[PDB]
Amino acid sequence: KVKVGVNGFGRIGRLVTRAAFNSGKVDIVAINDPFIDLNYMVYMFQYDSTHGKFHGTVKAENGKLVINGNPITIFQERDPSKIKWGDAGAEYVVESTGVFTTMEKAGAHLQGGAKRVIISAPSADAPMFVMGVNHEKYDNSLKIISNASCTTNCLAPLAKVIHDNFGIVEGLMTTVHAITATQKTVDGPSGKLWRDGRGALQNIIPASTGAAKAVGKVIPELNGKLTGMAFRVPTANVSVVDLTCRLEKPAKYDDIKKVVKQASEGPLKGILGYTEHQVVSSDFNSDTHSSTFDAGAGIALNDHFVKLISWYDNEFGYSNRVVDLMAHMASKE
Amino acid sequence: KVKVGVNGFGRIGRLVTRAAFNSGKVDIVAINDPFIDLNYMVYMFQYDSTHGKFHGTVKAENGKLVINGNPITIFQERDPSKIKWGDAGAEYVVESTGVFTTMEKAGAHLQGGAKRVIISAPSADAPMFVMGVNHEKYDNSLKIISNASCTTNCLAPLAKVIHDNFGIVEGLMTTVHAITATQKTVDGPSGKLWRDGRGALQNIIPASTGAAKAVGKVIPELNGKLTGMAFRVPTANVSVVDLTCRLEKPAKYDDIKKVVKQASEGPLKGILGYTEHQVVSSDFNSDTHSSTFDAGAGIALNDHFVKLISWYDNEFGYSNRVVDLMAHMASKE
Amino acid sequence: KVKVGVNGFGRIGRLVTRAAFNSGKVDIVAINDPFIDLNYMVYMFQYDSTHGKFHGTVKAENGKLVINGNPITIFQERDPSKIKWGDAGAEYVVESTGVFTTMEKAGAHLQGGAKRVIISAPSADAPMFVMGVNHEKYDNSLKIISNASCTTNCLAPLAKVIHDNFGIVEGLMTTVHAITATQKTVDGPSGKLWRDGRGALQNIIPASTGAAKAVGKVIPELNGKLTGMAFRVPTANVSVVDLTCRLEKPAKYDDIKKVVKQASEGPLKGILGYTEHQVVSSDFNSDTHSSTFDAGAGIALNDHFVKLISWYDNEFGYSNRVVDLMAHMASKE
Amino acid sequence: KVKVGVNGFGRIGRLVTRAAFNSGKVDIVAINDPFIDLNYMVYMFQYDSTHGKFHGTVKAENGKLVINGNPITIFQERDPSKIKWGDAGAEYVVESTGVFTTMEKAGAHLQGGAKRVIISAPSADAPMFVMGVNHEKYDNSLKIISNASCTTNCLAPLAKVIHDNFGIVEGLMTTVHAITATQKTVDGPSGKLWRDGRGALQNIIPASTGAAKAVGKVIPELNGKLTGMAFRVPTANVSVVDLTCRLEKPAKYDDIKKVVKQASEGPLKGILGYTEHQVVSSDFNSDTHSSTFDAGAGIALNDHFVKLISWYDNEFGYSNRVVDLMAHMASKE
Ligand SMILES: NC(=O)c1ccc[n+]([C@@H]2O[C@H](COP(=O)([O-])OP(=O)(O)OC[C@H]3O[C@@H](n4cnc5c(N)ncnc54)[C@H](O)[C@@H]3O)[C@@H](O)[C@H]2O)c1
Ligand SMILES: NC(=O)c1ccc[n+]([C@@H]2O[C@H](COP(=O)([O-])OP(=O)(O)OC[C@H]3O[C@@H](n4cnc5c(N)ncnc54)[C@H](O)[C@@H]3O)[C@@H](O)[C@H]2O)c1
Ligand SMILES: NC(=O)c1ccc[n+]([C@@H]2O[C@H](COP(=O)([O-])OP(=O)(O)OC[C@H]3O[C@@H](n4cnc5c(N)ncnc54)[C@H](O)[C@@H]3O)[C@@H](O)[C@H]2O)c1
Ligand SMILES: [Zn+2]
Ligand SMILES: [Zn+2]
Ligand SMILES: [Zn+2]
Ligand SMILES: [Zn+2]
Incomplete structure (x- = not known):
């Protein structure tokens, strides 16, 4: 229309x-x-x-x-x-x-x-x-x-569900990110960002990102509670987020799975996915979700400290x- | 001899x-x-x-x-x-x-x-x-x-320094890891570990690893305080550790840089390296350190909660x- | 049925x-x-x-x-x-x-x-x-x-058309071939075929193939008149044949294009394809043709000596x- | 000086x-x-x-x-x-x-x-x-x-030796070439050469080159007798030439090996190399030769029609x- x-x-x-x-x-x-x-x-x-x-x-x-x-x-x-x-x-x-x-x-x-x-x-x-x-x-x-960005659209829906249910005290994010058009095929000039000029086929490349901090703009209660960084790796598409967070309320991993799955079937359907399958990045190629929680890949140290994994076709x-x-x-x- | x-x-x-x-x-x-x-x-x-x-x-x-x-x-x-x-x-x-x-x-x-x-x-x-x-x-x-493993040899020297100086309450690790001989060129059988059979050149592949838990065996005081997981990505060599930890005593990121650098010049010389250069993974090919702290790549949310990055030629x-x-x-x- | x-x-x-x-x-x-x-x-x-x-x-x-x-x-x-x-x-x-x-x-x-x-x-x-x-x-x-093989199925239909119309006196083929399951992620053992053991992600790898010689079995008139070799390269799928042949009857490149297109629309429809588009290998991923002639990519030195290019999803x-x-x-x- | x-x-x-x-x-x-x-x-x-x-x-x-x-x-x-x-x-x-x-x-x-x-x-x-x-x-x-170009420097020393000893009647060249800085990490704009805009990591990309024809300028007797083309493939460095030629004098493959080895040890030392080892592209990284003849990789159809392979760190x-x-x-x- x-x-x-x-x-x-x-x-x-x-x-x-x-x-x-x-x-x-x-x-x-x-x-x-x-x-x-x-x-x-x-x-x-x-x-x-x-x-x-x-x-x-x-x-x-x-x-x-x-x-x-x-x-x-x-x-x-x-x-x-x-x-x-x-x-x-x-x-x-x-x-x-x-x-x-x-x-x-x-x-x-x-x-x-x-x-x-x-x-x-x-x-x-x-x-x-x-x-x-x-x-x-x-x-x-x-x-x-x-x-916003592709990464903020991955992180924010998952952060919303986790924060709504258990409360994020603090979190640090890593994104393992597919290569993009701003990168180079072989070592070349990138004056403001030297690592990003290095050959994209040959290298894992660390990079800064404001995406985690940005979640604080779309979810005001998380302002100042999240930050993170990225690694660029030599895949053509599909990226993954790793959110490591401390929770204020106890959250058994099975309870985390339940509320994310419930969110994926209701108010965030089409936006936040949920899977228990043994997936790898290519399984999300042309996937239209913002974020798909990988139940099997994540890991908890205890009921208050967990690492959560979510895939996205960037x-x-x-x-x-x-x-x-x-x-x-x-x-x- | x-x-x-x-x-x-x-x-x-x-x-x-x-x-x-x-x-x-x-x-x-x-x-x-x-x-x-x-x-x-x-x-x-x-x-x-x-x-x-x-x-x-x-x-x-x-x-x-x-x-x-x-x-x-x-x-x-x-x-x-x-x-x-x-x-x-x-x-x-x-x-x-x-x-x-x-x-x-x-x-x-x-x-x-x-x-x-x-x-x-x-x-x-x-x-x-x-x-x-x-x-x-x-x-x-x-x-x-x-x-131990390549990953445990990367994490443990760094964990030793952080714990000796500030104490690690709890930590979660991710490693972005080069491909290895156990992986497959195209989707093939790996019946015990289905994701590991998926084509290594095409995919980011999550994998379990006991390496962070093993740090608690070589550093007994960290028993039960660490765990983590891995992503396999399409590079033929050189990997990187991302350690997200809560410190018992507060440290500014500059304090952390100082004690890691001091360790690399003294008792852990040749084992733990330290750099502030704008490095990417290929800069560590054939590097004989167990671990090289990347000062520029890491990030702190606050004085107690930090993400530390270290490279290793696995x-x-x-x-x-x-x-x-x-x-x-x-x-x- | x-x-x-x-x-x-x-x-x-x-x-x-x-x-x-x-x-x-x-x-x-x-x-x-x-x-x-x-x-x-x-x-x-x-x-x-x-x-x-x-x-x-x-x-x-x-x-x-x-x-x-x-x-x-x-x-x-x-x-x-x-x-x-x-x-x-x-x-x-x-x-x-x-x-x-x-x-x-x-x-x-x-x-x-x-x-x-x-x-x-x-x-x-x-x-x-x-x-x-x-x-x-x-x-x-x-x-x-x-x-037969994937490569023989790519070469033979094209060879049939060229030989039927102009007569192949002798031909030498190269195939640039995607990786396969028999290759290795990193340098590993391949005792009968040492080069095939070398890391597939890192290397262009020459390989012997009987694919061109085999065309002489399915087209007896071409027995002894064709052979070739392969290069394995680090792509996951889709391969390409480069056939350099001497022709007995004169063949302007426009005439070759004409008879190949005609074949692709008739008896060889679905087997032999024809394109003038500016294609690259990924454009053939999941293409069900045995062989697709790339009109733009080939080149003639003269009316009796030509290099013909044909793509195949192996x-x-x-x-x-x-x-x-x-x-x-x-x-x- | x-x-x-x-x-x-x-x-x-x-x-x-x-x-x-x-x-x-x-x-x-x-x-x-x-x-x-x-x-x-x-x-x-x-x-x-x-x-x-x-x-x-x-x-x-x-x-x-x-x-x-x-x-x-x-x-x-x-x-x-x-x-x-x-x-x-x-x-x-x-x-x-x-x-x-x-x-x-x-x-x-x-x-x-x-x-x-x-x-x-x-x-x-x-x-x-x-x-x-x-x-x-x-x-x-x-x-x-x-x-000249990297490719012309690979082909010309080899063609000189072959032409000097056996006479090249005509030849057609393919180079399988590493990616360069003019290529793109993902599908992007290349308005004059559309294929060259397609993602270099994902694709085999055919390209025109004047390199073979140029051999006819540095070796005037071969003017008009050579042309060729290229395939760009996803490797960061080292390329290979495939020369298919008709010879005027009979040339057993062992005799071709003999005169190329002789040239590599004498007048063309340091420029044209010779190997019988089971080499792959990475074995030539940082190799300072213009051209290294791969004896085991080439193949003869008969005494007058041969495919010769030479490697070069471009x-x-x-x-x-x-x-x-x-x-x-x-x-x-
Ligand atoms: N590659 C790394 O980065 C790395 C780092 C640290 C530890 N490791 C560990 O080192 C060990 C070997 O790893 P790799 O990468 O060298 O694997 P690899 O496949 O390259 O080497 C293992 C080999 O042992 C041979 N072999 C198989 N069965 C044998 C048998 N019964 N007797 C004698 N030899 C046999 C194989 O032919 C092969 O050469 C593994 O346990 C691995 O987890 C690997
Ligand atoms: N992949 C290609 O591009 C291609 C194209 C044309 C022809 N081929 C040929 O097809 C054949 C299969 O190649 P591939 O690429 O599918 O390799 P693959 O490794 O993917 O397939 C081999 C399959 O056979 C199974 N297998 C092994 N031993 C078995 C046994 N005793 N009984 C039953 N199953 C067994 C394996 O578990 C595996 O799944 C080969 O001969 C190959 O030369 C391959
Ligand atoms: N890379 C190879 O394999 C290879 C081999 C032989 C020849 N060549 C040719 O060498 C030349 C350079 O190729 P390359 O691979 O090094 O490319 P490149 O992109 O790596 O280098 C080009 C350099 O020139 C700089 N530059 C651009 N405009 C400039 C200007 N007006 N004044 C001064 N500097 C400028 C760029 O910043 C860049 O650093 C090309 O002509 C190429 O065809 C390349
Ligand atoms: Zn405090
Ligand atoms: Zn000075
Ligand atoms: Zn019947
Ligand atoms: Zn038999």
Whole structure:
């Protein structure tokens, strides 16, 4: 129902578009990318090394990108304030380039007639939402918002359930994360982040992440109670979170399993998964959950100190949450 | 000085043999491996995908393996009780096949004339030793011992320093671990451990490990205070430990850095390393430390709750510790 | 329609089973594998790192493996002459273990009541067949046959078309081949084939193959005119043939493209594919063609000397050809 | 003797610098790279994922990069015509950015006082030289020259020997090539070469190359007689050439081995290697040969039609040839 524009046709832009057409919850009507012409867009959308060939039809016709017979207007503007979203009918714009994450910069899309802007990344100052956690705090006065990061969307739903039931005193998170586009095939320049320049095929690479701290924004009672770090490893997709936390109320591991499984079947269905299967990362490729609790992999030292494991398709889970968030916003109009 | 036999000419058997000849601390005089004949041993020892070509000479001569001009008796026995270690002059035997890790099974080497046996792996019942941590507890009545695991040798020196200075109330460990010979190139059978059969090149694979619990055997005061788990990831060598612990006495992260650095320059020199450089895993390939604390990668939530990161070459550090252990044993005879 | 037993539930056994149910062309009614019990079979068949979760249902019930509601008798015999195929109603048996590839050994399945045996690998003595090339030479007198290799199934249909139209004077093939189960995660023992023991993740590994020579068996006119070799590279699936040949009749590259495309739309439809897209190996993952000609990738030096490139999913193409061969056999009785 | 500046401190720029300090044949006195400042250069030079830590000392002092006690002037200019090479005493400049490969663009270094320029890549118009093949055709009138590509340096020495002894009528080349810095970690934009944008970890990627045709420039008698293509595969370093050629004179494979071994021990020593060992790509990491003939890997169809295999460390062999070529140029002044 709501008509959507996508700024950037990178991994996130293309998979948000894919999720939109797969789920049908929103209608994509425009895309902007200065570095990718129409014929090339067709190729990049249709073929995907990680998620396979698109399920449906894609073609160029009359200067438009036509996906499942739905024509999409293509822009090639470097300056977001110059994109004519309004003339194309785009109401919501997904800001997925990674370089306009502030209110100031993302807000440029409004000048072109966009009504609201969803930043598909953390923002220094735009309000952040995580589906299943605080999305009900959204309201119509908000024209520029953020859907946080893939890792925060993994951690927050699980932290919510654990905190609601047992109370997190403090927690430290590690994420073992699949490689991304910001990394390098061989040792190359990454001036602000030296480790991240090192060859991605050859190395386990430690990295900082604000994702754990960010959970404190979407779950205010956990402000200051979580932090963490990441390791990048040479897999193409799917990542995993390891949350080590101290609990205030006693929590037998079997009681933890019960409340997570109950959450996965009710209010967080589709967002927080639960499995007891002997899974490995490839079993979550193209999985649309934000977070899937791995009952078998986690371990408790005692009833107050536990390590909890949750898998996430860092591409597909997040992409589908952007769509879900827009669908929720549209329902509130 | 002490003459050594190696059972199992694998990753660890070969690299123990390299360490012995590179350091000169022990003399290898016999090798048994029923799945590698003499001419094949020359090839497997000389060329190493991970650590490069052997620096030295290796050839087959008169039915012996000759390394740097030293002849080595070669056995081809499946049954360890049948290996004639005594005839070859092997006084200590490194049990590095992976399949004889109880005192009962490893003790078979005594029937062929070995005086002592060092199991290159955790043992359900053999006393375990970690160089720098409890090796001075070894005494001459122990004919069969264990050098623990690569992961225990990483965690224990660091845990020793943290516990000695601040005390560890409780800790949970994750290791991000390189692939090993027990894993599979593509999805295949592993009936006792289903996740471990899944393709190692494609997957992040959670795995159980007793390594953190074993730290409580080499540091008795930590008995019951540590446990953990592992993720196998697609790198051919070098692993990393992530220790999340609660301290009984408060420490600023700078205090922790100070005492670890001091330990690495003094009593744990060569065993525990310390760095502030922007390292990645390949920077530790062929590094002979048991453990190298990564000061920049770690993070503290508060003065009592911290995540400490330490790197280890799981092949090369451990192999050198096996040699160091035997040298220390021989000094006690 | 024909009822089928599978000996060995491995990459090929499982994917033959998956192809049978996906296509519906034969009915699997029995499976034997001593190293994978019933509950483990469910897991190994349902989850696949390479091809994703099975599209359908799989469970254990009443001692049977049930796939899409169809019950399958499960055997656990090490000795093929003891498998009761007849009692389970299996008429054809796919011998996919890799260790019974001679007529003498594969013939053991006839003792337990199977009528015909199809060896899913080259055989020293069983007649070999490639669908689209010589399958019409099959006849009802043949009780034990071979479906050749994945590489032979890629090369032969392409060779057939080129030879039929232009005449191959001589040809040399290279295949760049994905890793397989016979390879090793780290440098390990492979006594008959030393290079194949070297770590698969770390190495390009040259290997001998009789695949090109074997084309001269399924296309007798090409006996002695083709041979080749392979390079194993660190990808989990999908391989590619590079055929360099001298042609007797002049052949502009556009003429080669024309006759290959024509073949792909006619007698070889589903076996030999044709593309002009800018493809890479992952675009062929789960592609059921034996061979897909890459028009853009090949190159001609002149009208008589050309290099032709053809892609193949070595797992899925071959599996589907085993099923197609059995369906063809069944149509003759 | 000759003093050298390096433009572009990348894989080749850094390894040229390493090769220069290791061999002592030339003196590096200046480096330009606008994307790598002085402190970062220390780090990038000292640590190398592929070739390990620099053996020697490296530090920043007084605004100079100091390698083994030798100070190097550091420039940060995007525009090559603005680099003050003369002031720094740099007589020859290695042009290794990958973006100034024509004589007109590379000639910009003369404006800042360089005397000669060596392009570390093929050039559309600069004369190309391969050490051991046509470097004696260099003369003092050539102020801007090219060292060709890594692949051309592998193929040309081998082709010289084969052509000299047996005569190459025609040949077709495939190179199975390690990934490079121009490739992408995950599917991303490569608008001119779509396949090259596809994830390098996940894919075998076909690519065009002028390397075989270029052999016809450095060996004029082979003009028009060779072409070829490449497959990029997921390994971080070391590549291999597969040369399929028709010979005019009969050449038993043992005779081919004889004359290649002879060349490797005499006129082409240090450039063309020869092995009969069971090698794999990692055995050539940091190998300084341009080309190493793999006797056991090649195969003959008959006396006039053969496939010859040669390995090359695409980073390290080539970097050493750049240094060798500059020292030879200096000897002609
Ligand atoms: N690889 C590491 O990082 C590492 C580190 C610490 C400890 N370990 C442990 O060392 C031991 C060996 O591990 P690995 O990585 O070297 O494995 P590996 O497979 O590379 O080597 C084991 C070997 O022993 C041989 N062997 C098998 N059965 C034998 C028998 N009956 N008699 C004699 N030889 C036999 C095999 O042919 C092979 O060479 C294991 O217990 C392992 O858990 C490994
Ligand atoms: N994987 C490919 O790309 C491919 C392609 C074409 C042909 N092939 C051929 O198919 C055959 C199987 O190859 P794979 O890739 O599936 O290897 P695999 O290791 O995955 O399969 C072998 C299976 O056979 C089982 N097995 C072993 N011994 C057995 C016995 N006595 N009785 C019953 N089952 C037994 C094993 O448990 C295993 O599951 C080989 O001959 C191979 O050359 C493989
Ligand atoms: N890597 C190989 O295997 C190999 C082998 C032979 C030749 N080459 C060729 O050598 C050249 C460099 O290749 P590479 O693999 O080292 O790539 P690279 O990306 O690792 O290095 C390029 C370097 O040049 C720098 N640079 C970019 N623009 C610059 C500018 N205007 N001025 C100064 N520096 C600039 C970059 O920061 C980078 O450090 C290319 O032409 C390549 O084709 C590469
Ligand atoms: Zn306190
Ligand atoms: Zn036979
Ligand atoms: Zn019938
Ligand atoms: Zn000084």
